[PDB]
Amino acid sequence: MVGLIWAQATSGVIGRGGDIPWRLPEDQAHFREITMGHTIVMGRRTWDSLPAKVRPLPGRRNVVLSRQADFMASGAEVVGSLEEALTSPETWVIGGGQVYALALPYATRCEVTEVDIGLPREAGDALAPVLDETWRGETGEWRFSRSGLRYRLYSYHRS
Amino acid sequence: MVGLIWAQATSGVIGRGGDIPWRLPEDQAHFREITMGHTIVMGRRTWDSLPAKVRPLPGRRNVVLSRQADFMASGAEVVGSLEEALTSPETWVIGGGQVYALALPYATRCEVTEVDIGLPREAGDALAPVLDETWRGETGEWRFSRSGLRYRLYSYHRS
Ligand SMILES: NC(=O)C1=CN([C@@H]2O[C@H](COP(=O)(O)OP(=O)(O)OC[C@H]3O[C@@H](n4cnc5c(N)ncnc54)[C@H](OP(=O)(O)O)[C@@H]3O)[C@@H](O)[C@H]2O)C=CC1
Numbered sequence: 001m002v003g004l005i006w007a008q009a010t011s012g013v014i015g016r017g018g019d020i021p022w023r024l025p026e027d028q029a030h031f032r033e034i035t036m037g038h039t040i041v042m043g044r045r046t047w048d049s050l051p052a053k054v055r056p057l058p059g060r061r062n063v064v065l066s067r068q069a070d071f072m073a074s075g076a077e078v079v080g081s082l083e084e085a086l087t088s089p090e091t092w093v094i095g096g097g098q099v100y101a102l103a104l105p106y107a108t109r110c111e112v113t114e115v116d117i118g119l120p121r122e123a124g125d126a127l128a129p130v131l132d133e134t135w136r137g138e139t140g141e142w143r144f145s146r147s148g149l150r151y152r153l154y155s156y157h158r159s
Numbered sequence: 160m161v162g163l164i165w166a167q168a169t170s171g172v173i174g175r176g177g178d179i180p181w182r183l184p185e186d187q188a189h190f191r192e193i194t195m196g197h198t199i200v201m202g203r204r205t206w207d208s209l210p211a212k213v214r215p216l217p218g219r220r221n222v223v224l225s226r227q228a229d230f231m232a233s234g235a236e237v238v239g240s241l242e243e244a245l246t247s248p249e250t251w252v253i254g255g256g257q258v259y260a261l262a263l264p265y266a267t268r269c270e271v272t273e274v275d276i277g278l279p280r281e282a283g284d285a286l287a288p289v290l291d292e293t294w295r296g297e298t299g300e301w302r303f304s305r306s307g308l309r310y311r312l313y314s315y316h317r318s
């Protein structure tokens with residue numbers, strides 16, 4: 001069971017200048033609830049942006065898609081290809097927009113956090129992947145973050 | 160990943176007289192996308208209560224939990240304990256109310272449909288399992304079933 005997890009503005013932006021243009025504690029805890037105990041797969045840039053206190057993320061099998069034979073994520077399995085990383089019953093892909101895209105065909109779940117934020121798309125922006133017709137799921141009921149923005153949740157089996 | 164899926168009245172009734180006191184085609188179809196292609200484990204009564212036509216549930220690994228050493232179920236595996244069914248990576252328990260109880264300790268997902276139907280509990284009723292503080296839930300927005308009843312989805316997870 002490959003799945004995808006990400007948080008985006010309504011515009012589809014998920015990353016900007018290597019960081020995130022917001023910070024939702026609530027969504028952090030959801031991210032951890034769904035991934036805890038499972039294998040997590042990330043591209044290099046994602047890994048590098050992890051604050052050292054949680055490189056690797058605890059209780060999870062950290063896997064990094066790179067292609068440098070010497071990249072060596074301290075506390076992570078470095079892997080040259082995606083399907084070379086999915087040996088598991090539950091695997092969550094955690095970005096970035098690049099890794100996401102390569103993973104979407106093998107995926108049956110996407111857990112999507114939508115942040116009510118006017119964030120028009122700028123060149124260079126990292127975007128959430130585009131889910132076609134086969135992806136079904138509720139449109140979560142809105143919520144206030146203690147940060148002051150609105151957010152909601154989305155989920156998609158398929159097949 | 161072992162999940163529970165059931166529909167319940169607001170009182171907690173999930174069944175009565177061996178059957179269900181509503182019929183929501185939207186919930187039937189949600190049951191279909193969730194379980195499709197995966198392993199489904201049910202008690203012998205739940206299996207019997209399937210009409211000959213859709214027994215076994217197609218596209219799914221039909222497992223029936225029983226004690227009769229002789230019990231046949233053309234199109235299902237009869238196993239003696241729950242775990243004899245936990246091979247595959249995504250597994251969905253569909254009752255009856257006894258088997259839910261067995262499976263709860265192994266479960267991280269409960270996909271629950273609450274039906275806005277005033278169904279005061281009665282003796283003999285099958286009830287929904289009680290979720291303690293450990294289970295997280297994004298509730299749902301009330302929808303309208305064409306059969307006339309409102310209903311909503313709870314998706315429960317714990318690490
Ligand atoms: N909003 C959210 O929910 C999330 C936000 N983000 C944001 O998104 C961005 C992260 O995305 P991105 O910048 O793309 O970083 P990534 O970590 O996704 O970088 C991907 C890298 O992995 C390797 N790779 C990718 N695809 C393949 C493949 N098919 N085969 C082999 N190697 C591959 C490449 O390195 P190599 O050349 O070595 O192969 C590539 O450069 C950041 O800006 C971050 O802040 C991050 C995650 C979630």
Ligand SMILES: NC(=O)C1=CN([C@@H]2O[C@H](COP(=O)(O)OP(=O)(O)OC[C@H]3O[C@@H](n4cnc5c(N)ncnc54)[C@H](OP(=O)(O)O)[C@@H]3O)[C@@H](O)[C@H]2O)C=CC1
Pocket residue numbers: 164165166167173174175176177178179201202203204205206208224225226227230239240241253254255256257258261285
């Ligand atoms: N609303 C909903 O979403 C749902 C509705 N339902 C309703 O619920 C009812 C079904 O639940 P219920 O009546 O409790 O029946 P069950 O489906 O729980 O029947 C359980 C059966 O499985 C076997 N079994 C039970 N426990 C064990 C065990 N520990 N080890 C081995 N075998 C075991 C037994 O068969 P044996 O006697 O041969 O040993 C037992 O009779 C029906 O009325 C149905 O309509 C069902 C599921 C979901």
Ligand SMILES: CS(=O)(=O)Nc1cccc(-c2nc(N)nc(N)c2C#CC2CC2)c1
Pocket residue numbers: 005006007020027028029031046049050094095113
């Ligand atoms: C670490 S961070 O990016 O600075 N900020 C942060 C904190 C906590 C969670 C999330 C997050 N939430 C959702 N919904 N989906 C996700 N994929 C991620 C993520 C991520 C990448 C770091 C690995 C983001």
Ligand SMILES: [Co+2]
Pocket residue numbers: 033034035036037038267317318
């Ligand atoms: Co989990």
